[PDB]
Structures are given as structure tokens and as C-alpha cells.
Design an enzyme around this catalytic site. Structure first.
Site, PDB file in Angstrom:
ATOM      1  N   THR B  18      43.702  38.684  51.378  1.00 12.71           N
ATOM      2  CA  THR B  18      44.245  38.218  50.103  1.00 12.71           C
ATOM      3  C   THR B  18      45.419  37.274  50.340  1.00 12.71           C
ATOM      4  OG1 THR B  18      43.425  40.178  48.997  1.00 12.71           O
ATOM      5  CG2 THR B  18      45.223  38.971  47.883  1.00 12.71           C
ATOM      6  N   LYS B  39      37.162  37.421  43.769  1.00 15.45           N
ATOM      7  CA  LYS B  39      37.099  38.729  44.404  1.00 15.45           C
ATOM      8  C   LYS B  39      35.975  39.491  43.753  1.00 15.45           C
ATOM      9  CE  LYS B  39      38.863  42.386  46.812  1.00 15.45           C
ATOM     10  NZ  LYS B  39      39.092  42.504  48.293  1.00 15.45           N
ATOM     11  N   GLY B 123      37.266  45.011  52.756  1.00 15.24           N
ATOM     12  CA  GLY B 123      37.196  45.478  54.128  1.00 15.24           C
ATOM     13  C   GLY B 123      36.741  44.384  55.097  1.00 15.24           C
ATOM     14  N   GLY B 155      45.526  45.529  70.019  1.00 15.59           N
ATOM     15  CA  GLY B 155      44.180  45.865  69.620  1.00 15.59           C
ATOM     16  C   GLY B 155      43.398  44.723  69.011  1.00 15.59           C
ATOM     17  N   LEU B 180      49.454  36.074  61.480  1.00 14.54           N
ATOM     18  CA  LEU B 180      50.669  36.386  62.255  1.00 14.54           C
ATOM     19  C   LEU B 180      51.835  36.540  61.297  1.00 14.54           C
ATOM     20  CD1 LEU B 180      52.193  36.729  64.821  1.00 14.54           C
ATOM     21  CD2 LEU B 180      52.207  34.224  65.077  1.00 14.54           C
ATOM     22  N   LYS B 181      52.281  37.793  61.181  1.00 12.24           N
ATOM     23  CA  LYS B 181      53.265  38.171  60.164  1.00 12.24           C
ATOM     24  C   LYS B 181      54.628  37.726  60.624  1.00 12.24           C
ATOM     25  CE  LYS B 181      50.710  42.340  58.543  1.00 12.24           C
ATOM     26  NZ  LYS B 181      49.982  42.763  59.805  1.00 12.24           N
TER      27      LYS B 181
HETATM   28  N1  LIG Z   1      55.693  41.941  55.902  1.00  6.68           N
HETATM   29  C1  LIG Z   1      54.521  41.239  55.822  1.00  6.68           C
HETATM   30  N2  LIG Z   1      53.478  41.762  55.128  1.00  6.68           N
HETATM   31  C2  LIG Z   1      52.294  41.075  55.013  1.00  6.68           C
HETATM   32  C3  LIG Z   1      52.049  39.774  55.602  1.00  6.68           C
HETATM   33  N3  LIG Z   1      50.722  39.410  55.361  1.00  6.68           N
HETATM   34  C4  LIG Z   1      50.198  40.404  54.613  1.00  6.68           C
HETATM   35  N4  LIG Z   1      51.157  41.350  54.406  1.00  6.68           N
HETATM   36  C5  LIG Z   1      51.033  42.617  53.672  1.00  6.68           C
HETATM   37  O1  LIG Z   1      49.988  43.354  54.213  1.00  6.68           O
HETATM   38  C6  LIG Z   1      49.347  44.083  53.171  1.00  6.68           C
HETATM   39  C7  LIG Z   1      47.839  43.742  53.243  1.00  6.68           C
HETATM   40  O2  LIG Z   1      47.657  42.357  52.995  1.00  6.68           O
HETATM   41  P1  LIG Z   1      46.385  41.789  52.174  1.00  6.68           P
HETATM   42  O3  LIG Z   1      46.538  40.298  52.192  1.00  6.68           O
HETATM   43  O4  LIG Z   1      46.296  42.429  50.856  1.00  6.68           O
HETATM   44  O5  LIG Z   1      45.225  42.226  53.106  1.00  6.68           O
HETATM   45  P2  LIG Z   1      43.646  42.535  52.759  1.00  6.68           P
HETATM   46  O6  LIG Z   1      43.583  43.989  52.324  1.00  6.68           O
HETATM   47  O7  LIG Z   1      42.929  42.220  54.056  1.00  6.68           O
HETATM   48  O8  LIG Z   1      43.245  41.537  51.637  1.00  6.68           O
HETATM   49  C8  LIG Z   1      49.981  43.642  51.871  1.00  6.68           C
HETATM   50  O9  LIG Z   1      50.925  44.663  51.511  1.00  6.68           O
HETATM   51  C9  LIG Z   1      50.691  42.351  52.222  1.00  6.68           C
HETATM   52  O10 LIG Z   1      51.800  42.052  51.363  1.00  6.68           O
HETATM   53  C10 LIG Z   1      53.252  39.272  56.321  1.00  6.68           C
HETATM   54  O11 LIG Z   1      53.180  38.157  56.893  1.00  6.68           O
HETATM   55  N5  LIG Z   1      54.392  40.026  56.392  1.00  6.68           N
HETATM   56  N1  LIG Z   2      48.012  52.405  75.624  1.00  6.77           N
HETATM   57  C1  LIG Z   2      47.797  51.134  76.327  1.00  6.77           C
HETATM   58  C2  LIG Z   2      46.762  50.512  75.467  1.00  6.77           C
HETATM   59  C3  LIG Z   2      46.393  49.097  75.835  1.00  6.77           C
HETATM   60  C4  LIG Z   2      45.485  48.538  74.706  1.00  6.77           C
HETATM   61  C5  LIG Z   2      44.984  47.123  74.986  1.00  6.77           C
HETATM   62  C6  LIG Z   2      44.314  46.544  73.689  1.00  6.77           C
HETATM   63  C7  LIG Z   2      43.919  45.101  73.911  1.00  6.77           C
HETATM   64  C8  LIG Z   2      43.303  44.529  72.577  1.00  6.77           C
HETATM   65  O1  LIG Z   2      42.167  44.922  72.312  1.00  6.77           O
HETATM   66  O2  LIG Z   2      44.002  43.771  71.887  1.00  6.77           O
HETATM   67  N1  LIG Z   3      41.762  48.279  49.443  1.00 13.06           N
HETATM   68  C1  LIG Z   3      40.436  48.866  49.216  1.00 13.06           C
HETATM   69  C2  LIG Z   3      39.853  48.770  50.575  1.00 13.06           C
HETATM   70  C3  LIG Z   3      38.503  49.422  50.737  1.00 13.06           C
HETATM   71  C4  LIG Z   3      38.160  49.427  52.252  1.00 13.06           C
HETATM   72  C5  LIG Z   3      36.780  50.007  52.553  1.00 13.06           C
HETATM   73  C6  LIG Z   3      36.635  50.225  54.101  1.00 13.06           C
HETATM   74  C7  LIG Z   3      35.322  50.910  54.407  1.00 13.06           C
HETATM   75  C8  LIG Z   3      35.229  51.168  55.960  1.00 13.06           C
HETATM   76  O1  LIG Z   3      35.003  50.170  56.645  1.00 13.06           O
HETATM   77  O2  LIG Z   3      35.422  52.321  56.374  1.00 13.06           O
HETATM   78 MG   LIG Z   4      42.374  41.900  49.864  1.00 17.40          MG
END
Ligand SMILES: Nc1nc2c(ncn2[C@@H]2O[C@H](COP(=O)(O)OP(=O)(O)O)[C@@H](O)[C@H]2O)c(=O)[nH]1
Ligand SMILES: NCCCCCCCC(=O)O
Ligand SMILES: NCCCCCCCC(=O)O
Ligand SMILES: [Mg+2]
Ligand SMILES: Nc1nc2c(ncn2[C@@H]2O[C@H](COP(=O)(O)OP(=O)(O)O)[C@@H](O)[C@H]2O)c(=O)[nH]1
Ligand SMILES: [Mg+2]
Ligand SMILES: [Mg+2]
Ligand SMILES: [Mg+2]
EC number: 6.3.3.3
Lengths: 224, 224
Positions: B18, B39, B123, B155, B180-181
Site C-alpha cells: 500500500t 484494491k 498478502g 531474511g 527500504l524503510k
Molecule cells: N516506519 C515505517 N513504516 C512503514 C514504512 N513503509 C511501510 N510502513 C508501515 O508498515 C505497515 C505495513 O505497510 P503497508 O504498506 O500497509 O503494507 P502491505 O500490508 O504490504 O500493503 C504500515 O503500518 C506502514 O505505515 C516505512 O518506510 N517506515
Molecule cells: N541466525 C542467523 C540467521 C542468518 C539468516 C540469513 C538469512 C538470509 C536471507 O534470507 O536474507
Molecule cells: N491485512 C490483511 C492481510 C491478510 C493476509 C492474508 C495472508 C494469508 C497467508 O499467506 O497466510
Molecule cells: Mg496493503
């Protein structure tokens, strides 16, 4: 045959590989299936200061069968950086790329003396070890069976199915098992209804780890 | 052609679909590329009490181009349950399976009046909509391009590469972009070194969303 080998991977880091590996090995040992736990590659560790790494926990359990084991017998590439192994190796040990041929030999050697060799990876399946090989490639080279541990939270459907797609595209026997943590009953409301449906429609069902010790032991030991 | 269509998926929920969709649409609009945000399916919502759902945020932005838009014009299947859409639908609306043919028509209708139609999923890619179709299937039926948003934490390599594998196995044009936040500089130390390597070795690079507004607009609009 020599001992069976089971690779343990996951949806990602922190899903429960170590926890589930230890539970499975404990169950197998209690059943008379002599089982060792190995962590060939581990990142994010400082062994001078900390004795609670996955390999250390494995070592504690393993010494119940062999007092002579030491950390270096069960874990071979260990890095400080909390990262994928390839990155850690390039930064900390640039002259020694991880040698999966060597690892394959070391891991298979344990099949002489154990009924089951459990090999925990690091992170998930696509985590890079060398430029050419990821964790799944390593499992393939090992000719191990695969147990893929999933987390138990919202989002697990996607993560399990992404892994199902990758695994079913390769030549190995695998199970996906959810690590259902204590106190989580949202799982049964939110995610389980889809697991239920999926299992009626799939030849290879997604199981709950905690329900599945017997089944997973059978899986690990079956066939050649 | 009629307007282009870009589906936005993610490594999982909460990755930044989003947030990134809104940033991209804002940039496109500022560049003269008239862009709507849709959406079509949303779970976990209660519209009687809460006006901050993804569709509500999209609606706010969209009304800058069309005052007449209402929520029902841009979001069509909406459920209270915080779950995959299939499960929510079976529990709350058992007599109305989600109709992706209908959705395809509704979404394509916007290509008459917009240069770019951005469609956020729910999702990740493997999230089920009907018994037979997941989010990726829906994107395929739409004949949209795909933008897959990744999280920025440890990850992400695994999660991006699992999605790369699934996407490269299907017949669609796609980009993977990391959200990248602000305040995260661990990313550049921990994950970026692998992204860098991957991009030198891949025909379809993983990019950072915040670096890529121009590139992603070009991607969305290119060709037929
Ligand atoms: N602090 C911070 N929060 C972020 C950023 N990008 C997304 N978020 C937060 O992460 C949460 C999930 O983001 P959203 O865009 O809704 O993700 P979606 O569920 O994949 O659509 C929300 O609470 C956003 O406000 C960022 O750059 N910084
Ligand atoms: N606890 C050590 C864990 C190392 C995880 C590496 C994840 C790499 C990725 O898939 O981004
Ligand atoms: N914010 C509503 C998000 C719904 C996410 C559904 C994820 C299902 C899954 O892959 O387990
Ligand atoms: Mg969303
Ligand atoms: N509270 C709780 N924590 C758990 C459970 N299973 C695993 N953990 C914790 O989750 C964290 C990650 O588990 P671990 O087995 O190390 O996962 P890995 O990184 O995939 O090997 C550790 O802190 C565990 O103690 C559980 O059932 N309940
Ligand atoms: Mg761990
Ligand atoms: Mg572990
Ligand atoms: Mg969300």
C-alpha cells in the site's frame, strides 16, 4: 543402508528449525533410533563469548550419546556476521569459500555410526552458501530428505506454498511442518482452515510439527 | 493501447504494498501519467468503524482525480476476518465465491480512463482467492505486469528468491523491489551485498523501491 539423513530448512530464520530438530532427535532417540544433530554452517555467532548457538544446543544433546563430541565435530563453517553464509564468508574469510563437497563427506561419515543424521541449514532454502549453491542445492547434493519448518503466524500460507512450489520442482522427498507455538490458538481460526483444504487436494500434506513426531520419524527413515 | 495495468504483490502482508503503491501513483500522477489505485479484495476490515483500510487510503488519493469515486468503485470483495480471502469468503459469504472474471472486467474498465491502473493484491502471491486461484493466478488472468514488494529485514534474500523462482516460472513481466524503510542502515550492511552480487548475475535485477520511482514507472508503461 547406512544411516538416513534429514535436512531441516524453514520458511525463514527464526521459524523453529533448531527447536523442532531437537524435539525430533529426542523423540527418535527415545524410540531407539540413534540420531545426531549437525549444524554444518552457522552465522551470527561468537563462540568466545556465547555457548547458546544452535551448534552448542545440538552438542549438549549429542553428548548424551558420545561424550567425545566437540563443537568442531558438528559445525564446520562459523561466522560472526548475522547474515547469509555467502556474505559472511566473503567478508570474514575471503580465501575460503564454503566447500560443500567437503561438507557432504563430513556429514555422510556420521551415517556409519547413527541411524539418523539430522542436518540443520541456515535461514531458508534460497539462502546462498557459495556463488553457485544455496541451501536447497546443498540438500540436493547430500541426497537427504527435507523437512521444512514453517512459522505459525498470519502469512504462513503464502510462505508454505512458495516453498511447496520450489520443492515440488526438484528431485527430493520433502515434508512441510508448521511449528505451532504454545499459546497460539489464532492459528486454528486463521490459517488451519486453508491447511485443511489444501491437504484434501494435495498428495503431500502440510502437517503440524507437534502432532507429527511419529509421522516425521517414519518419513525420515523410510526407504533407501 | 488502453491504459497499462500493474499488479502489486509482496513477499507477504505488511511488506509495503500500500505504501509503495501510493508513492508510485503519486509520482506517476506528478509526471502526467494519470494513475488510479485499486484494491479489489481486502480482508481484515470493518468499514462501519474504520476509514483507514488500504481501499480508504487509495480512495483519498484517487479523489484528487475523480470526486465521484466511492469505496465500492475501487474495492469489491471486503471481509472482516484477518485471513486469506478464500477463508474469509467461505466463513462470511459462503454463497458468493470471489469471481475473478468479474473482477477482471471491472479492473480493465478503468484502462479506458487512466494511463495506468495499479491493482494491489492481498498478502503474497500464493494467497488463495478461490479454490482454484491464488493472487498470482489473478494477476495472470489480468495480463498485468507485476511489481513485488519485499520487506527490508534479515531474511529478505530468501523471500525475494522464492518469489523470483515462482515468477520466472510463469508468463509475465515482473520486478522485485525492496521497501527500504527510513532509519534502516543494517540493510546496506547485511542484505545489500548479496542483492549487488545477484544483480551482476541476473537478467532481471532486484531493485530498491525508493531508488526506483522512474524505473518502475518506465517498467509499468513499457510496450503493449
Ligand atoms: N516506519 C515505517 N513504516 C512503514 C514504512 N513503509 C511501510 N510502513 C508501515 O508498515 C505497515 C505495513 O505497510 P503497508 O504498506 O500497509 O503494507 P502491505 O500490508 O504490504 O500493503 C504500515 O503500518 C506502514 O505505515 C516505512 O518506510 N517506515
Ligand atoms: N541466525 C542467523 C540467521 C542468518 C539468516 C540469513 C538469512 C538470509 C536471507 O534470507 O536474507
Ligand atoms: N491485512 C490483511 C492481510 C491478510 C493476509 C492474508 C495472508 C494469508 C497467508 O499467506 O497466510
Ligand atoms: Mg496493503
Ligand atoms: N515462546 C515460544 N518460542 C519458541 C517456540 N519455538 C521456537 N521458539 C523460539 O523462537 C526462536 C527461534 O527458534 P529456533 O528454533 O532457533 O528457530 P531457527 O532460527 O529456525 O532455528 C527461539 O528464541 C525459540 O526459543 C515456542 O513454541 N514458543
Ligand atoms: Mg535461528
Ligand atoms: Mg536454528
Ligand atoms: Mg496490510
Amino acid at each position: 543402508f547406512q544411516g538416513h539423513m534429514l535436512f531441516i530448512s524453514a520458511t525463514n530464520t527464526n521459524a523453529g528449525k533448531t527447536t523442532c530438530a531437537r524435539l525430533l532427535a529426542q523423540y527418535c532417540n527415545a524410540c531407539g533410533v540413534k540420531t545426531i544433530l549437525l549444524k554444518p554452517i552457522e552465522t551470527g555467532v561468537n563462540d568466545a563469548i556465547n555457548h547458546s548457538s544452535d551448534a552448542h544446543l545440538f552438542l549438549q544433546d549429542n553428548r548424551l550419546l558420545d561424550r567425545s563430541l566437540t563443537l568442531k565435530d558438528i559445525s564446520f563453517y562459523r561466522y560472526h556476521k548475522v547474515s547469509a553464509p555467502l556474505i559472511a564468508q566473503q567478508e570474514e574469510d575471503p580465501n575460503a569459500p564454503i566447500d560443500t563437497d567437503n561438507l557432504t563427506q563430513r556429514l555422510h561419515n556420521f551415517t556409519k555410526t547413527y541411524d539418523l543424521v539430522i542436518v540443520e541449514g541456515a535461514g531458508g532454502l534460497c539462502v546462498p552458501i557459495t556463488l553457485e549453491e544455496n541451501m536447497l542445492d546443498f540438500a540436493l547434493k547430500l541426497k537427504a530428505k527435507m523437512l521444512l519448518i514453517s512459522h505459525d503466524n498470519l502469512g504462513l500460507i503464502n510462505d508454505c506454498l512458495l516453498n511447496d512450489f520450489l520443492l515440488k520442482s526438484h528431485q527430493l522427498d520433502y515434508k512441510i511442518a508448521i511449528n505451532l507455538k504454545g499459546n497460539n490458538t489464532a492459528f486454528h481460526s486463521i490459517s488451519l482452515p486453508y491447511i485443511e483444504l489444501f491437504n484434501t487436494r494435495s498428495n503431500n500434506p502440510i502437517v503440524i510439527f507437534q502432532q507429527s513426531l511419529k509421522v516425521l520419524m517414519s518419513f525420515a527413515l523410510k526407504g533407501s
